[PDB]
Design a protein around this nucleic acid. Structure first.
Lengths: 149, 77, 418, 234
RNA sequence: AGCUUGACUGCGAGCGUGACGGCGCGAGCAGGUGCGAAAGCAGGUCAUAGUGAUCCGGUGGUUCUGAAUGGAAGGGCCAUC
RNA sequence: UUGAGCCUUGAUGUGUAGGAUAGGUGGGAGGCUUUGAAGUGUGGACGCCAGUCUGCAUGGAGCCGACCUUGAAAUACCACCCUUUAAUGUUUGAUGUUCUAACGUUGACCCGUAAUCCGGGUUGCGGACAGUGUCUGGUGGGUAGUUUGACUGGGGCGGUC
RNA sequence: GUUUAUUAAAAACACAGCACUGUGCAAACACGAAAGUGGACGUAUACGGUGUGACGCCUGCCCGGUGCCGGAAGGUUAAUAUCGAAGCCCCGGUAAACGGCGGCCGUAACUAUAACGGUCCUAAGGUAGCGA
C-alpha cells in the first residue's frame, strides 16, 4: 500500500517520506512496527500536522536504534542500549547480560552459543564490557568495550 | 472452510472445456489462505481465513473495518 | 556451366505455378529442367525467414540467367525493386516477366516497370496460352547459339531412399547432414514437378527425401494449408522408395501419431531403418532401451539398425550409410521358384497346413512375382481356406530360413485346383 | 564513433515530446531554431502502418492535391487511345500522340509531367539504371498509371507535390519551402491530411493515421494539433 | 498458310432430355465487336468423358442494407475463391 | 552479479561511367557556418586496407564549400527517414549471496485441561521458500462417451461403388 | 497347501527360496477431493512394490583409468591449395580388454584338447555343469 513513514530515518525512506511500497513489506514490517503509518488522502493530512510533534518528540531517543542495530545483526559485538545510545556512551551494568536480555535478529544468535558465567558480565562505567566468545564450551574470551551511539 | 469471510467465497461451478465443447463440470476454488492479521486494536493476531482478492480489500479499508465487521456479520471474530 | 531461367519475383506466390507450367519432367527428382524445343534448362526458385533468404541467395549466384516475376494485381513494390537491384550489381542478365498476366490486354506493362532498372516486361500465360511463346523464344535464341548440358541387376538403378519421420524433429537438418559431411546447406529449391512440392533430391545418384509438415524444419515456399497436403507428399515418399528411414527422437519420438506412422510403414512396403537423431544430449541412463523394446515387440523384422546421431554432432553417420546397403541386398535378392518351394515343404510338414471343413488342402509350388520388395504367389487351396495368419506363418518361415534384413516380404495365394 | 549523445538530448528536450503547436506557429519557428544556416524545409512526417499494400506510402512520385500551388511544373499531355480522345476535345495544354511522340523520343526532354496513356510515360520520368536525381529529377508516377487525360490536364497545369525516400511504412511528405507563405503551407498539410484519410481501404487496422508531425532539420521538429483523424475526412 | 482474339457482351422464340436437384441443343433480336474483297462467317474446341449440392468463410465491386441520430461494422446483392 | 525493452549519438552505400564509397533531399549550386576552413582509426559499398577513410586529435590559404562534371546520380546551401552501431540516459527481468518478517514447523516445553485431539504462548529449527489458488504447456485407455458402410447367389473373405 | 458355494480340483491359484526395483520418514505408497487415516507405535538385514517359483546342476561380461571400435565436428599425424580429412585420441559406442569365464600350436605321458606364453583380438582362455 502506501504509508507516510513515522520512522526517523530508515535505510530507504526517511523522516515523513510518504511513498508507496510492496504490500508484503508494508503490512508486515513497515507497519505494524512504527516505522510507518498507512497513507490515505485522509491520513496524510492528519499525519502531516502530527509529524512535527511525533517524528520529533518520539524520534529523539531512537537515534540509538539505528546504531545499536548493526551490533545485533552481526552478534559479534552484541550491543544494545537498556538506557543509553542517547545518554552518551553505553555505560553501567545496564545493556545486555545482567538481565540476560539482548535483542536477537531472528532467534539464531551468537550471544548464547554457550552459557557458563556465574553472575553475567558488565560491571564497568563510562563504557560497558561485553564478553565476546572464543569457543562454544570454553570462555577464554577477548572482551571488548564497544559502544553504539 | 474455503471462504473469505468478507468477500464471500466457496468453490463455484465449472467444467474443463474444449473446443470440442464437451459436457463435464468441476467447480473452482478461490485463492484464500488463512493469514495472520494483526489487530493492533487489542494488539494481538486474530488469524482469519481470507481471499486473495480480499487480502487486498482488507488492506485498503484497514484492519478494524474488516474487524469492524464479523461482529456485524454475526460470526467468529 | 549450364543456364537456368531462375525465377524470382519476390519470395513466393504464383512463382511456383509458373515453373510447373514450364516443366513437365518428374523423376530425373528436383533439378529437374523445363524443356523448350530441343533445349532444356533448369529453373530456380518483407521480413522473411533467415534460412529461406540463405537458400535463395545461394540459388541466384550459381544461377545462369534470371527471371524476375510480377503479378496482375501486383505492380509497385519496393522490396521487389531491391531484389532486382541486387541482381544487377552481382551481374547476370535478368528478364522481367509477369505471372498470370491478366489486366485487360497489355497496358500497365511496360509503364510502371521502366523504373524497375529494367525495361521491357513481357506479359506471360499459364491459364490461357499466349504469353508463354515469347518468353520461351527469347531464351531460345541465345541458347540455340550456345548448346549447353542437358532379373534386372541391383545396380540398374541407384538406391532410392527417403527420410520420413515425425512432424516435430528437425529432420530436414538430419537430411542436410546425410547429403553433407561437407558442412554445407543443400535445401535450395528449384522446381520441376507438377505444382508446388517438394524435395527428393539426389547426391551420389541415390535419392533422399525430406517430409511431413512443420517441426521437420519445413519452413519452405509453402503449399499445405492444412495437415493434409504434406501427407500427399509422404505417400509420394512411399512411391519413390525402395528404402525409407524413420527418424524418431528420444525425448518426443514414438508419439501416438508416430507409432501409427511405423504401422503405416509396414503398409508402405519399403525397407525400414530406424534412426534416433539429436541423441548425444540424452541422459546417461538412457530412457530409451524400453522405447526400442516397445517398437521391437510390434515388431518389424528387418535389421533395425538403430542410429544414435545428431545433426549437430554426427556419430551414426557411417553406420546409417552402411545399413541401408545391406538392407537393400536382402530386399532386392535374386529369387526364384526353386528356393521357395524347397524351404516351404519343410514348413508345412513341420506345422501342418490348416484343414477346412474335413477336407485337407494342398500346396504345390511357390514363385516369385518380383523381388525388389519380395512378393511370392503360392498356388494352393482357396483364399479363405487359409486364415491370414497361416499365410503369415508360412511367410515368416521364409523370412527366417533365408535372410531378410530388408523389408517385410509378401505372400499371396491363388486357387485353381479346388 | 559516439562521444556523447548530449548535444541531441538538450535540444529534443526543448521542443519534442509531442509538444503540439499551432500549425502556423510551427512554421514561424521552422526557419531557424538551432544554428541551421539559411531558411530550411517545411516537412510533415506522417506515420502509416503495415507492409503488403501502399496507396501513397513510399511513393517515388508526386500526386495531385487540393491547393496545387507551391510549384508549377512542365507538362505535356500525351493523348493516345484512352481518356485521350476526351482530352482532344478539351484542347487544354498541348494534346497530340505522334508529335509529342517525336518530342519524347528526340534526345532532349523538359516536359516533366507526362499525363499519359500508353507510350510516352516510360521514357521521361522513369529510366536510368541506378536512377535517382541530381537532387531533383523528372519523376514517373503522377497518376497516369491511373490514366484520365482531360480533367487530369486541369489538375496537372496547376502543379503538384513530390515526396520520396524508401520502403518504410511511415509516409513522409515534404510540404514545401519557407519561401512559401505560412497559410498556403497550412492548406498544403490540410489537403494531404484529407487525402490520407481517404487513403487505404484495406483493413489491417481501421485508423491508419498515427502521428501527424511537422518538422525541419537539426533536431527540430514538433507535433501537429492532430486533425487528420476519422470522422469523415477531416 | 495470311490475317485475327467471338473461348464477346446482354438476352432468348423454341425444343430435347432427366422423379426432382437438373442437364443439353437452339435460331433470332439487341448491343457492341472481330475477321473477311464482298457474300458471309465468329456465342471455345469432330461429336460423345475430363468432376460435386448445401453450408460456412476468403477475394473484388455495389449503397442495397444499416436498431436514437450520422457515420462505421457485419450481412444481402453482383462477380469470383 | 548480469541479460535484455526503449532513448537519443556513429556514418555511408562494388557494372563503362561512377575519383571510391550512387541507402533516402523540401527546395537545390551562398551560408559571411563570423574562428586562418581541411587532408591523420570507429565509419565506409566493402575490408576492394587502399587513397577517396570519418562534423573524428595539424593551423597552413580571403568567411567559405576552396563552382560544376558526368552517370542513373556528384559537390552554392543541404534534407527526408532506414539498415547498422555505439555512447549515454535508462527500463526491466534473470541469475548470485545473505537476511527475516510473512509462511512452514509430524522440535521442545508452558498453559486452558491431574486431555496422544485442538487451541494459545514461549523458545529451537526451516524460510520467502515450500506449498497451494488461478491461469497455463506437455502427458494421460486409468477414467468417459461413442464411432468401425454398403453391394453381396449365406456372409466375412475378395472385389467393387 | 489353496480353489471355480449351487457343472469344471488341476498341470490352475499359493508357497518358502530366489531375483529385481523403488523408497531416508512429513517415506515410498495407499485410501480419503481434504481434514484425516493406514503404511508403522515401525525404521533400509527394512518397508513397499514387482516378479520368478523348492532343491541340486547348466559358467550370468565392470566404459572409469588407459586402451580399443565405428564415426565425424575437432584434436593428433600430412602437403604447408592454408583449411588437414584417412589410421588413433575425442564424441558416442566398446570387458568373449589389462585382469576372473574359447579355440588353434607346444606342453599336465595315444602326440592332438591345456593351467603359461605365442597365434585370431591389447579374449580372459573347457577350471564349472556335462564326455563317442
Amino acid at each position: 500500500m502506501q504509508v507516510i513513514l513515522l520512522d526517523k530515518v530508515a535505510n530507504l525512506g526517511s523522516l515523513g517520506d510518504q511513498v508507496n511500497v510492496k504490500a508484503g513489506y508494508a503490512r508486515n514490517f513497515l507497519v505494524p512496527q512504527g516505522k510507518a503509518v498507512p497513507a490515505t488522502k485522509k491520513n496524510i493530512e492528519f499525519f502531516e500536522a502530527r509529524r512535527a510533534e511525533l517524528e520529533a518528540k518520539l524520534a529523539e531517543v531512537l537515534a540509538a536504534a539505528n546504531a545499536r542495530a548493526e551490533k545485533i545483526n552481526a552478534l559479534e559485538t552484541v550491543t544494545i542500549a537498556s538506557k543509553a545510545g542517547d545518554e552518551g556512551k553505553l555505560f553501567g551494568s545496564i545493556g545486555t547480560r545482567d538481565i540476560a536480555d539482548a535483542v536477537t535478529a531472528a532467534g539464531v544468535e551468537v550471544a548464547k552459543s554457550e552459557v557458563r558465567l556465574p553472575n553475567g558480565v558488565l560491571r564497568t562505567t563510562g563504557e560497558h564490557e561485553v564478553s565476546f566468545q572464543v569457543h562454544s564450551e570454553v570462555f577464554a574470551k577477548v572482551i571488548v568495550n564497544v559502544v553504539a551511539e | 472452510s474455503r471462504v473469505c469471510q468478507v468477500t464471500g467465497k466457496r468453490p463455484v461451478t465449472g467444467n474443463n472445456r474444449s473446443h470440442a465443447l464437451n459436457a463435464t463440470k468441476r467447480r473452482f476454488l478461490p485463492n484464500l489462505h488463512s493469514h495472520r492479521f494483526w489487530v493492533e486494536s487489542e494488539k494481538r493476531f486474530v488469524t482469519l481465513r481470507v481471499s486473495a482478492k480480499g487480502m487486498r480489500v482488507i488492506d485498503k479499508k484497514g484492519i478494524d473495518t474488516v474487524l469492524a465487521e464479523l461482529r456485524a456479520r454475526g460470526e467468529k471474530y | 556451366m549450364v543456364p537456368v531461367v531462375a525465377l524470382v519475383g519476390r519470395p513466393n506466390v504464383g512463382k511456383s505455378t509458373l515453373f510447373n507450367r514450364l516443366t513437365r519432367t518428374r523423376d530425373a527428382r528436383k533439378y529437374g529442367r523445363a524443356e523448350i524445343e530441343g533445349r532444356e534448362f533448369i529453373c530456380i526458385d518483407d521480413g522473411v525467414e533467415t534460412r529461406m533468404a540463405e537458400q535463395s541467395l545461394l540459388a541466384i549466384e550459381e544461377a545462369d540467367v534470371v527471371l524476375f516475376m510480377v503479378d496482375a494485381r501486383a505492380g509497385l513494390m519496393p522490396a521487389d525493386e531491391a531484389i532486382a537491384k541486387h541482381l544487377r550489381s552481382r551481374e547476370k542478365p535478368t528478364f522481367l516477366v509477369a505471372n498470370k498476366t491478366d489486366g485487360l490486354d497489355p497496358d500497365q506493362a511496360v509503364v510502371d516497370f521502366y523504373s524497375l532498372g529494367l525495361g521491357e516486361i513481357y506479359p506471360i500465360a499459364a491459364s490461357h496460352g499466349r504469353g508463354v511463346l515469347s518468353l520461351l523464344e527469347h531464351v531460345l535464341l541465345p541458347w540455340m547459339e550456345d548448346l549447353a548440358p542437358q532379373d534386372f541387376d541391383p545396380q540398374s538403378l541407384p538406391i532410392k531412399l527417403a527420410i520420413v519421420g515425425r512432424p516435430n524433429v528437425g529432420k530436414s537438418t538430419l537430411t542436410n547432414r546425410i547429403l553433407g559431411e561437407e558442412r554445407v546447406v543443400v535445401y535450395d529449391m528449384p522446381g520441376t514437378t507438377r505444382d508446388s512440392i517438394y524435395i527428393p533430391m539426389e547426391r551420389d545418384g541415390r535419392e533422399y527425401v525430406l517430409i511431413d509438415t512443420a517441426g521437420v524444419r519445413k519452413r519452405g515456399k509453402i503449399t499445405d494449408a492444412v495437415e493434409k497436403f504434406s501427407v500427399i507428399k509422404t505417400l509420394q515418399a512411399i512411391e519413390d522408395a525402395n528404402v525409407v528411414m524413420l527418424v524418431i527422437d528420444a525425448r518426443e519420438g514414438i508419439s501416438d501419431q508416430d507409432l501409427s506412422l511405423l504401422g503405416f510403414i509396414l503398409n508402405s512396403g519399403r525397407s525400414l531403418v530406424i534412426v534416433v537423431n539429436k541423441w548425444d544430449g540424452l541422459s546417461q541412463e538412457v530412457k530409451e532401451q524400453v522405447k526400442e523394446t516397445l517398437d521391437f515387440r510390434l515388431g518389424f523384422i528387418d535389421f533395425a539398425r538403430v542410429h544414435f546421431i545428431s545433426a549437430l554432432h554426427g556419430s551414426g553417420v557411417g553406420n546409417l550409410f552402411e545399413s541401408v546397403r545391406e538392407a537393400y541386398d536382402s530386399s532386392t535378392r535374386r529369387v526364384g521358384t526353386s528356393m521357395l518351394t524347397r524351404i516351404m515343404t519343410m514348413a508345412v510338414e513341420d506345422h501342418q497346413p490348416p484343414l477346412v471343413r474335413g477336407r485337407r488342402v494342398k500346396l504345390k509350388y511357390a514363385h516369385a512375382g518380383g523381388y525388389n520388395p519380395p512378393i511370392v504367389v503360392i498356388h494352393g487351396n482357396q483364399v479363405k481356406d487359409l486364415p491370414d495368419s497361416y499365410k503369415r506363418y508360412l511367410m515368416n518361415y521364409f523370412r527366417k530360413s533365408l535372410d531378410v534384413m530388408g523389408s517385410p516380404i509378401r505372400i499371396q495365394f491363388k486357387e485353381g485346383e479346388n | 564513433m559516439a562521444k556523447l549523445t548530449k548535444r541531441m538530448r538538450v535540444i529534443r528536450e526543448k521542443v519534442d515530446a509531442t509538444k503540439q503547436y499551432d500549425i502556423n506557429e510551427a512554421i514561424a519557428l521552422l526557419k531557424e531554431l538551432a544554428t541551421a544556416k539559411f531558411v530550411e524545409s517545411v516537412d510533415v512526417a506522417v506515420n502509416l502502418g503495415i507492409d503488403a499494400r501502399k496507396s501513397d506510402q513510399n511513393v517515388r512520385g508526386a500526386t495531385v492535391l487540393p491547393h496545387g500551388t507551391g510549384r508549377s511544373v512542365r507538362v505535356a499531355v500525351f493523348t493516345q487511345g484512352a481518356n485521350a480522345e476526351a482530352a482532344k476535345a478539351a484542347g487544354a495544354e498541348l494534346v497530340g500522340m505522334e508529335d509529342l511522340a517525336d518530342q519524347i523520343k528526340k534526345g532532349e526532354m523538359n516536359f516533366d509531367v507526362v499525363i499519359a496513356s500508353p507510350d510516352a510515360m516510360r521514357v521521361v520520368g522513369q529510366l536510368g539504371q541506378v536512377l535517382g536525381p541530381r537532387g531533383l529529377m523528372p519523376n514517373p508516377k503522377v497518376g497516369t498509371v491511373t490514366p484520365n487525360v482531360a480533367e487530369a490536364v486541369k489538375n496537372a497545369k496547376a502543379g503538384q507535390v513530390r515526396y520520396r525516400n524508401d520502403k518504410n511504412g511511415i509516409i513522409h511528405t515534404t510540404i514545401g519551402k519557407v519561401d512559401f507563405d505560412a497559410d498556403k503551407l497550412k492548406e498544403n498539410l490540410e489537403a494531404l491530411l484529407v487525402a490520407l484519410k481517404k487513403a487505404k481501404p484495406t483493413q489491417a487496422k481501421g485508423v491508419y493515421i498515427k502521428k501527424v508531425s511537422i518538422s525541419t532539420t537539426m533536431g527540430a521538429g514538433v507535433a501537429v494539433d492532430q486533425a487528420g483523424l476519422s470522422a469523415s475526412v477531416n
